[PDB]
Symmetry: D2
Subunit: 324 residues, 4 copies
Amino acid sequence: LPNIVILATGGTIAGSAATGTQTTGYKAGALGVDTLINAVPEVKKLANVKGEQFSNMASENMTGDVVLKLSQRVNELLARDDVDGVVITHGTDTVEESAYFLHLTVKSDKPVVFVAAMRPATAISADGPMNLLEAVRVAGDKQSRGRGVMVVINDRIGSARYITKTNASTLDTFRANEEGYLGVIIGNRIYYQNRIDKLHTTRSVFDVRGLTSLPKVDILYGYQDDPEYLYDAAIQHGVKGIVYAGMGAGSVSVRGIAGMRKALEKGVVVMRSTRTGNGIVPPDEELPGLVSDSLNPAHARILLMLALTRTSDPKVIQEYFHTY
Amino acid sequence: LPNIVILATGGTIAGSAATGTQTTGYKAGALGVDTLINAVPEVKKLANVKGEQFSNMASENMTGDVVLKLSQRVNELLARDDVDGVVITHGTDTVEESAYFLHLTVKSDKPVVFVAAMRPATAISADGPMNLLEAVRVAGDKQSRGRGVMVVINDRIGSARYITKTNASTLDTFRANEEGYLGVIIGNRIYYQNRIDKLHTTRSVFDVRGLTSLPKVDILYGYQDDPEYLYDAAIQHGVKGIVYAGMGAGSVSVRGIAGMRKALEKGVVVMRSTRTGNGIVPPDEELPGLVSDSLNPAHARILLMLALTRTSDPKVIQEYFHTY
Amino acid sequence: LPNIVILATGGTIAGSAATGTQTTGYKAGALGVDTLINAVPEVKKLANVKGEQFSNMASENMTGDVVLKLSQRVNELLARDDVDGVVITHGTDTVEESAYFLHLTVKSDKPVVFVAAMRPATAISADGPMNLLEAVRVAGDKQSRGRGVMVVINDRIGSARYITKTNASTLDTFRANEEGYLGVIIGNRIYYQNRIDKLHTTRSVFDVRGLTSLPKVDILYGYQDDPEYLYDAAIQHGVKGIVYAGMGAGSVSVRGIAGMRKALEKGVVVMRSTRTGNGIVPPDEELPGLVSDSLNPAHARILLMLALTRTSDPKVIQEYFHTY
Amino acid sequence: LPNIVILATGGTIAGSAATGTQTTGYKAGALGVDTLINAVPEVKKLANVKGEQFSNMASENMTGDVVLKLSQRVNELLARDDVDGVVITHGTDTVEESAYFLHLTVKSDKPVVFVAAMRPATAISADGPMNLLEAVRVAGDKQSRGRGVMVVINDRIGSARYITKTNASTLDTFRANEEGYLGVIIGNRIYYQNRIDKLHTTRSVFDVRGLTSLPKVDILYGYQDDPEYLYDAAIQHGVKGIVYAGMGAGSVSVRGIAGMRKALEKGVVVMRSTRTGNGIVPPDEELPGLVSDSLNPAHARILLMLALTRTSDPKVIQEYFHTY
Ligand SMILES: *[C@](*)(CO)CC[C@H](N)C(=O)O
Ligand SMILES: *[C@](*)(CO)CC[C@H](N)C(=O)O
Ligand SMILES: *[C@](*)(CO)CC[C@H](N)C(=O)O
Ligand SMILES: *[C@](*)(CO)CC[C@H](N)C(=O)O
């Protein structure tokens, strides 16, 4: 059987509540990895699993420095001959962030599968058990290699570069409206549909094994009456980059333009993304800053942080955004 | 023929570029209302149209004080016996904000139909002509009365309370994933599907007659490493409310919590929404602030501003968010 | 507490397999209603539940004669003062057909909620328990009255007229792409979003309490090289109506039109629907037969079958399709 | 500039009506290929184009004998040094059938791009011009090679294997809900997202040179009370295969089982697909026939016909369905 390491970080999949009817406001990251494994013994028929407790927190508290350590640990594990793949339990709220980070930094073709759950382990009809089982099946399948980092949940396999939490509270929240899923798992069988046409993992230039932190990047929203002072505040607090979750295709108000101008004069890299949820923010030489291609705000921040560890050249960073 | 006033505010539907191939980075709010009307002569067959130039700007620059004037002007028009409905041309980027504002403040059952276009009027296969014709048809149909403010584009009729721009650059960007459309227009016939189960227009308590300004409300994003200083900044500039485009179901990091506690101490109303794009942010007594129900950040800000013109009582405001 | 009757008919929600990993090819309608109730005792805190075993079969074998009896029993149940609502367990495959039949034939405003499950009761992360809890919650809520027949599953409430199984094997299969959900259930709370703008239940003319059989209506597919002989066969077997799951907007090939014309000449009523999955089949005076509005083939057959119990008048039947 | 041949077959993109408001019931395949090119001269700045009138029909009348000739002509064309790609104008109703057929029979990596329109050329805001321009850009782009046959419309690039017409009459009808788009076209730039993970074109074993017709395959629908006599009829007319657009995951009623057994006894290959619209029909040893993987009925019929040109062995045909 394939040797799979289940690296636990917390989340609802490891969460609990006083009753089985409480599906919200529960405590995330309360249960240990072995408890998750023991809850679904069937996994042992899919692989020889080993649980490792990396952390146990609600993902809203996951930070770049910790995500950095997570990627470095996964790289250490994948370098071992006795490890064929890694399943990472993580809270749903920022899994797209953590997953995309490793998508760009893991130097291996071995499967790296993030798994999550929208209902706590104690809930009636909890989704975590089946999602974990599916994650291990995907991580241990020889056909899962070289596909980039994946996020498995609700019978779907999504690419870390496209998948995002689209709904605040539903089981089927993870979707990539325009890009679809890399594959699906039905009747204990994996059906691979797509291979992402972007750079990742073994073909990524982003290596952070020699770093302990990443350049600071904040996200500012775009909306009617958006304030200039928020740009002032970000600049003053030392951001290296600003991701703009803009109105429409990264459109900017006169106040947003003034704020971006100030940011650029201070050497801050401005990246225009969109608040809409999907789609392409196209180049526009008439507006300040760079454009995020199809990366949403959360994803754009991650790539910009990594881009900044390599260069400050806007043209190079822009190309990264069209290829990663 | 019904008497329909076409109130123009600008946008891509009135946008232009030097060539028919340029569909991005064009000049929004460039053409006059009579030019749009004459571009689609067919509207004159569906109604007695009167064009009125309210403004002509790109919607990223639409501001609350101007939206306020727009609502009062529309209210004024619909009180006239010689006006059966109004069609408001508006840029796509913030039409959901302006539309929901009128949805809550226009005290009339007569149709109020926002219309927009994703391609400039000069573009090959421009969508504005048909969108406008559809809008006029909807505004003039007596079966269109008492449905709340609507947004018409790409053969669909969306409720101001549910519809949102979900894609940065596509023609089919306006969708209400979980709520669907109020109706669709195919083959010059309107097919009404749903009636929104929420308070609006004639049943709304949000009277804004005579007002000239609105309570200041800003939006802060939720993501890994989100900074506390952004909350400090908002408070320092006297916001009356803060809408949080949070991770997942409005989950908050330890930094976000500290920032929210500070805001509450200063009497600022905190409203937790979601950055995901869809869904319910449920009540959670363990977290600070109020919850946005299914309102996304842009819509939540609008309702909060209007709520604050009547009260600062969190319980009353929260009820508004579950009923409007 | 409301008095809710759980009327069981079978399905995967009452399905069972030898292993917890077998989610496909299991035995549907294997467990009794009381076993379902005692398995999710939490329902007892939401209402006073009484189980009744109407049948126990796989929905692919549900027949019109039996659905007729189900409708009649439900009418009997709801006429009682000691019954506040009914939850009907049913297999997912044809629940949209049974649900829409009762949607048209139940003469009561009391809630009628069909519930189902995509994973057998014996599977890991089975969805049936939560779905049932949600269905009872909906059936017993005073706010649920007069909304038409509903289908509850995966935290969603769909109208029988719009909801359809859109995916062969996923938990989130039930959706109404263009019409959205009537409401959702999150955190043990119901959020009603829409009220269907169509005739149903207490406003329907489709009373069939005095019937034991229904007009025969078959469905024929539209595709390249579709054969004329299938129409000849249906006619020869006494069909009173033919529903065409046509290419695009009910478009017809030279062979299909010949088939339809033979059917019309033979006294059969022809209804042109679509195989696409969504949308409007508009009127077309150059094509034979009636058009299905936005009803898909499965729904179209149900309405046509019921229409035929009242009339053979094309114009009357057509108006039914635009109003129900 | 690249050399692109625009091979016209008809459709709404070549449709015409007396007025610009008539977008339904128009005459498809009424305009010549050169008329389409002259209406969008911008294409000539993207490539050296040559129009070729293969046919001018409504796609509901496209037949296998003709599709065979279309595939053979495209192979002939792409074998030429002076042809960099081919754009095929085709009606929307069966473009998914014709496109998937060529996807399996064209032995070249040069771009094969089907294009269509949902509004006639004479319609207000006709989509045909932009759709064609985008199709030409995709067909002439070096990055477009080796991606399988594509269908371009409404700024989206869909794979012939996944794309399908999901709505009867909307501009955004073409979607692959679970698989997404191969790419999108925004601001005159192509953004490639995925590469399908299936066999096609140059790696396909389906050699159809010399063939003038294909094995007969008909499609029968699954629904409550589905008739056994339709299977008898199909058998009587000598079908070599039957694609079942089944209830749910290809579930079969007692009548369907009886009819399938009769067909199997007669040597007919029975393929179980789904009427739902999306998803996997998983293998089930308890049911008759083969399963269609994620192929919908229309796509399944095409692959089954081609499968039968090589073998009647069920095991082999099943593998084709899991790999193409
Ligand atoms: C449960 C749903 O995933 C709550 C998740 C936490 N907020 C987390 O992100 O860990
Ligand atoms: C054209 C697409 O709507 C650009 C719109 C402007 N940004 C606006 O919102 O007015
Ligand atoms: C399990 C998924 O619902 C199988 C359902 C049966 N085919 C049925 O419809 O009862
Ligand atoms: C116009 C929309 O595509 C009508 C299409 C024809 N039915 C066709 O398929 O050619």
